Design a protein around this nucleic acid. Structure first.
Length: 804
RNA sequence: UGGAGUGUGACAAUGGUGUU
RNA sequence: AAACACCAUUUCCACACUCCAAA
């Protein structure tokens, strides 16, 4: 439970399709770079200030040292060539129009060892080296561009994209140095956001108050205009233009600049009441062109510092946080999240205009970055045949990641005979005609799907308030003998839903299916169809199964599939969810949920949860799992060592405390949808749909993947909009010795066992379900050992997929 | 609360050190 | 205790959009 397994082989299954990844090949020398620790007092200075101080320190000490270093922004410094130092601390002083800096030697970072790591020589890739390289590549844009989070943003060179108000669209990119099979690469992905336009505040007023010009009104702002302008500018920073000095607007004056007064404190004799306009006329010899406009209150309210709008400009680099209107959000997405070819060209254009090969700090370390994206082979896996079981038992073949139930019926359809209707929406906007039409349409779609509604509902009443839920359900459960479903019509976002699921899933164990109000008024066969999918699953039926004869050889022996996800509170306990397959299809899943420490992603009580699932598996299959496939979802790379250490043992522990010496093979896999890796089709004819993304089933385990360990990218879904995010799978452990092809096909096949739609999903079904179970348990909570029993679902609910 | 996809948040939340 | 800086963590969740209902 310490070391992750090496990649066994390279996959050869599926049709090859020429691809390009957003990785850029780097040429790195064999030179050893020198690392030094800095010590700067005071110890609270911002990163930008630190880089500024170091920059001054470089040029002012050229006679002694620096015969061109890079900086972290925080106490870490690197140089290409060595300098006159030692292990001893070298302290000096600098001045910025006053700091004390101490430079200390740390260690040497050899890039020869990096080549040994990328080659077959050394197994471990030095993290300190990756850090150093990343600091180098980020040193210039950290000062040249505007850093946001881990990305760098900037304005537009030519065409300035506006948004209205004081906002505009700034574009940016996220860079990161990553190790590869043979050569180091630079991962880069573009993005966009909204910044405040660098313009005079007098024009900011014009754009906010919808003025063509400022001379449109000579009369002062009405109270509504003052509030509106204040709402937009309160908090922003502005620079002055009659001396430079940057200020922060805390408020907007009520009175005009001609009447706004303040304590003048003219040397001796203390304060005299003076207006702002008179001050700028006397002191700065400036007559106000627009004295009828209010002033910007700056700094401390006790300080009484005011500024006329015509001497203030809004400083650039200020990202917007305010709510975006319809036109703003539209223009945003109408300029971002574009199609795959568009994003592709954007990254290419970026890599062209960024010009890493001409920047001095990059050239200093003799680093060369390829200006073209990395070509990668890639291969599209073969979609599994989905077997439906009507009278004809037709088969659905996933075309482009999507299939349908046309002339097809469920593998195991349930004859719904007893069901109820409880509408919580007002009857005024939801008539009985709507309910009957919805009933007719549902009955038709249901019977066509293989899950026939044998007749009208035994119950149909309007209601209101969450307090009506728990009592009514009890009455419903005691009145009608053997009801199968309770349909709850909701008028939108309401606390009613949470209690419906609480009473339904935990308290009584009644199969409930909520429907939004609008879908009852106007009904489309597609919506009702997907709804039927949910119902049939919630009632214990089987929508569809994988083709038994068309499965990887792992199914030849009893194997259980596990999915795990963790959800954290907005101080409240977190909840971890672990699901497990309960048949050999694998269609049916059982859910286990626990409560945990705040924001602890490491599943603590996992062992007991696995034990429950294993026992339940045996009770449902009469077979003991020879294999365990654990799809962990939600953890990042920085948590791997921790998670893999505890959770793997927790799984193994559960297998020991259960029965004798029963130790099946555990395959620990980490699913990751959140990463800056993009994939594009090289051939224009290979593009799929409007979005023009890679075809569903695209598999990549070369060039852009880990040099030694077992990982692979798998785009298992078809891109509906924008650019697809290929789900990354990293095998942290494997006792069963899976081959690349087998595990990838198995994963891609489990992406077809999703029961809520007739499509291929981005992540495997167990991981998706586990996320659903967690997010469902989120509603059950709405003192620790008390709420611990709140997530404990019903006895009869346990044997079902309520989370669907 | 029919479903899937992908955009935004990073002056975010907390515990920590520290400031007139 | 009120703001304000910085260090290590937290991709949780929220909102929005697109498509399945046209030919």
């Amino acid at each position: 439970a310490f070391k992750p397994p090496p990649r066994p082989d390279f996959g050869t299954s599926g049709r090859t399709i020429k691809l390009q990844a957003n990785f850029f090949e780097m040429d790195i020398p064999k030179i050893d770079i020198y690392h030094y620790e800095l010590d700067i007092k005071p110890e609270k200075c911002p990163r930008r200030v630190n880089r500024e101080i170091v920059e001054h320190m470089v040029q002012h000490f050229k006679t002694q040292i620096f015969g061109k270093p890079v900086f972290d922004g925080r106490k870490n410094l690197y140089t290409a060539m060595p300098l006159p130092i030692g292990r001893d601390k070298v302290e000096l002083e600098v001045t910025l129009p006053i700091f004390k800096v101490s430079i200390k030697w740390v260690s040497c970072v050899s890039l020869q060892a990096l080549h040994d790591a990328l080659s077959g020589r050394l197994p471990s890739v030095p993290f300190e080296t990756i850090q150093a390289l990343d600091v180098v590549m980020r040193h210039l844009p950290s000062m040249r561009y505007t850093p946001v989070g881990r990305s760098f943003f900037t304005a537009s060179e030519g065409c300035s994209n506006p948004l209205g108000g004081g906002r505009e669209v700034w574009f940016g990119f996220h860079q990161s140095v990553r190790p590869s099979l043979w050569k180091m690469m630079l991962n880069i992905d573009v993005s966009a956001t909204a910044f405040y336009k660098a313009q005079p505040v007098i024009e900011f007023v014009c754009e906010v108050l919808d003025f063509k010009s400022i001379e449109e009104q000579q009369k002062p702002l009405t109270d509504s205009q003052r509030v509106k302008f204040t709402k937009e500018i309160k908090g922003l920073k502005v620079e002055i233009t009659h001396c430079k000095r940057k200020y922060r607007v805390c408020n907007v004056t009520r009175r005009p600049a001609s009447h706004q007064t303040f304590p003048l404190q003219q040397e001796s004799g203390q304060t005299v009441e003076c207006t702002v306009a008179q001050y700028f006329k006397d002191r700065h010899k400036l007559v106000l062109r627009y004295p009828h406009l209010p002033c910007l209150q700056v700094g401390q309210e006790q300080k009484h510092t005011y500024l006329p709008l015509e001497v203030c400009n809004i400083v650039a680099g200020q990202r917007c946080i305010k709510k975006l209107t319809d036109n703003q959000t539209s223009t945003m997405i109408r300029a971002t999240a574009r199609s795959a070819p568009d994003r592709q060209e954007e990254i290419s254009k970026l890599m062209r205009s960024a010009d890493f090969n001409t920047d001095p700090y990059v050239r200093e370390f003799g680093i060369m970055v390829k200006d073209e994206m990395t070509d990668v082979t890639g291969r599209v896996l073969q979609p599994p045949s989905i077997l439906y079981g009507g009278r004809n038992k037709a088969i659905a073949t996933p075309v482009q990641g999507v299939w349908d139930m046309r002339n097809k019926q469920f593998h195991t359809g349930i004859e719904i005979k007893v069901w109820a209707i409880a509408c919580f929406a007002p009857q005024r906007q939801c008539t009985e005609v709507h309910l009957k039409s919805f009933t007719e349409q549902l009955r038709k779609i249901s019977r066509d799907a293989g899950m026939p509604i044998q007749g009208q509902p035994c119950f149909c009443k309007y209601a209101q308030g969450a307090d009506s839920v728990e009592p009514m359900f009890r009455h419903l459960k005691n009145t009608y003998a053997g009801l199968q479903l309770v349909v709850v019509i909701l008028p939108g976002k309401t606390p009613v839903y949470a209690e419906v699921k609480r009473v339904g899933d935990t308290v009584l164990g009644m199969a409930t299916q909520c429907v939004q109000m609008k879908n009852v008024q106007r009904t489309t066969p597609q919506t009702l169809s997907n709804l039927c999918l949910k119902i049939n699953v919630k009632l214990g039926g089987v929508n569809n199964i994988l083709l038994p004869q068309g499965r990887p050889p792992v199914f030849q022996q009893p194997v259980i599939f596990l999915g795990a996800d963790v959800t954290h509170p907005p101080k409240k306990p977190s909840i971890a969810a672990v699901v497990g397959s309960m048949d050999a299809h694998p269609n049916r899943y059982c859910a286990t949920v626990r409560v945990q420490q705040h924001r602890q992603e490491i599943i603590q009580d996992l062992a007991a949860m696995v034990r429950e699932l294993l026992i339940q598996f045996y009770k449902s299959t009469r077979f003991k799992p020879t294999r365990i496939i654990f799809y962990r979802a939600g953890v990042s790379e920085g948590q791997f060592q921790q998670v893999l250490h505890h959770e793997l043992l927790a799984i193994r522990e559960a297998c020991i405390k259960l029965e004798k010496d029963y130790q099946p093979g555990i395959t620990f896999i980490v699913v990751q949808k959140r990463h800056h890796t993009r994939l594009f089709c090289t051939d224009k004819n290979e593009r799929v749909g409007k979005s023009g993304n890679i075809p569903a089933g695209t598999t990549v385990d070369t060039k852009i993947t880990h040099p030694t360990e077992f990982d692979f990218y798998l785009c298992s879904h078809a891109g509906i909009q924008g650019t697809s995010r290929p789900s990354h799978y990293h095998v942290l452990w494997d006792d069963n010795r899976f081959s690349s092809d087998e595990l990838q096909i198995l994963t891609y096949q489990l992406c077809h066992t999703y029961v809520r739609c007739t499509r291929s999903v981005s992540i495997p079904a167990p991981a998706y379900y586990a996320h659903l179970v967690a997010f469902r348990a989120r509603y059950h909570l709405v003192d620790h050992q008390a709420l611990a029993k709140a997530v404990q679902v019903h006895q009869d609910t346990l044997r079902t997929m309520y989370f669907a």
